[PDB]
């Protein structure tokens, strides 16, 4: 817990959540978890 979350939370904070809903998100959002 909180490990895989942390990366995805960084995603949720630095990337617009719309990325998972509608899209239209910058490619940085994709490599926010390069692990």
The approach used to solve this structure was NMR
**Dist CA 31 CA 18 (whole Å):** 16
What phi and psi values does residue 26 have, to the nearest 5 degrees?
-70, 150
Picking from 31, 7, 33, 11, the residue whose alpha carbon sits closest to that of residue 20 is 11
Question: Which residue do the tokens 């904070």 mark?
Answer: 13
Query: With the C-alpha atoms ordered 21, 22, 24, 27, is the resulting torsion angle positive or negative?
Result: positive
Structural domain that includes position 26? 3-32
Question: Which residue do the tokens 């998100």 mark?
Answer: 25
Number of domains in the chain: 1
How crowded is residue 10: how many other Cβ atoms within 10 Å of its Cβ?
A: 12
């Amino acid at each position: 817990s909180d490990e895989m979350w942390f990366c995805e939370t960084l995603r949720r904070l630095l990337c617009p959540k719309s990325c998972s809903i509608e899209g239209g998100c910058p490619e940085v959002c994709s490599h926010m978890c390069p692990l």
